[PDB]
């Protein structure tokens, strides 16, 4: 179940440098 | 759809102030924060306009004069463009796409200079466009601090807690000229979009329309932005853009739009509506759930696709080799 958890991780990128 | 303003002051805006596009839309609900339907929409991560949060009540008195006198002497990022489109681009990624030349440029500038640049353009009838986009920080003056402290933190903190969101990361101050447009894109954070001055038309698309909006490659400076020119869609490159359907609303002073994480949004300052002012509230999304349930949601597949592109860019040692390998994987095998 780790491959799934790994690929489901998200960042926090937004339209702000 | 335009709401009548109290005191018989007439309709705040008119349909003639809206740009024309090729796709249909249906309205986003406008509800009171006390309405359980509004709570249900936020919990299910669907957009809603909240009309009575008082989230930025102290900021509703903000105009260029008040801000210039009180917002301090810090630097403000101001974008300049000759087109109404202010396409966002990540400057840290331009190295890997050095044939990309943005149509807008960023200039660091004091607030009084931004007002002066605004005034000079207004005077000379020029067609240059400015869009101030600056995260609020501790350089702001005391009166702005007092206003900031006066936001309805009681309400939004309870939202943060009820949804399990992460930290508040930023409050982006947005001051744009009439007719300004931020092209369609999705953000990797939850957003409460608090309108202060002027009116903004917001067109949202759910995450399951990924196939119709064609984001740039992850390693491109315009990562998360749509490749489609909403003004002249190229249906041969982007055929499924003929299937998009938006959720639309016009927010005004006092309104707060919940833009759920991963939802595409196209936002424009109404034509002939004067300057617009907005402050957003960006929160990190909740973690991946303890138990994964199948089949996955659209936004989970988006997270997967992003991570595939990130991994390949790293493993191949060059982001521009990502496309060729992906095509090799699929041609005559999965297509
Ligand atoms: C910057 C903003 C767009 C706009 O208001 O022009 C946005 O996309 C956001 O708050 O997430
Ligand atoms: Zn956004």
Short mmCIF file of N, CA and C in Angstrom, two decimals, chain B residues 8 13-14 52 100 112 164 185 189 231 251 258 285 308 316:
data_model
loop_
_atom_site.label_atom_id
_atom_site.label_comp_id
_atom_site.label_asym_id
_atom_site.label_seq_id
_atom_site.Cartn_x
_atom_site.Cartn_y
_atom_site.Cartn_z
N UNK B 8 -31.68 50.91 -3.32
CA UNK B 8 -32.15 51.16 -4.68
C UNK B 8 -31.05 51.75 -5.55
N UNK B 13 -23.47 45.43 -11.48
CA UNK B 13 -22.76 45.20 -12.73
C UNK B 13 -23.76 44.76 -13.79
N UNK B 14 -23.26 44.62 -15.02
CA UNK B 14 -24.09 44.31 -16.16
C UNK B 14 -23.40 43.27 -17.03
N UNK B 52 -21.90 36.44 3.77
CA UNK B 52 -22.00 37.13 5.05
C UNK B 52 -21.01 36.58 6.07
N UNK B 100 10.72 29.80 -23.78
CA UNK B 100 9.49 30.39 -23.29
C UNK B 100 9.76 31.84 -22.90
N UNK B 112 3.49 53.42 -3.42
CA UNK B 112 3.22 54.74 -3.99
C UNK B 112 3.63 54.81 -5.45
N UNK B 164 -9.77 19.63 8.49
CA UNK B 164 -8.48 19.00 8.66
C UNK B 164 -7.38 19.60 7.81
N UNK B 185 -6.32 27.90 -14.27
CA UNK B 185 -5.29 27.14 -13.60
C UNK B 185 -5.90 26.54 -12.34
N UNK B 189 -3.48 24.19 -3.10
CA UNK B 189 -3.88 24.54 -1.74
C UNK B 189 -5.36 24.89 -1.75
N UNK B 231 -9.62 32.77 -25.40
CA UNK B 231 -10.08 33.74 -26.39
C UNK B 231 -10.10 33.16 -27.80
N UNK B 251 -18.23 37.77 -7.89
CA UNK B 251 -18.08 38.15 -6.49
C UNK B 251 -17.88 39.65 -6.39
N UNK B 258 -15.18 30.03 -1.95
CA UNK B 258 -14.36 28.87 -1.65
C UNK B 258 -13.93 28.23 -2.97
N UNK B 285 -3.61 21.49 2.05
CA UNK B 285 -4.64 20.48 2.11
C UNK B 285 -4.37 19.44 3.17
N UNK B 308 4.20 11.22 -11.35
CA UNK B 308 4.85 10.48 -12.43
C UNK B 308 5.76 11.41 -13.23
N UNK B 316 15.36 10.68 -15.43
CA UNK B 316 15.99 10.90 -16.73
C UNK B 316 17.06 11.97 -16.69
#
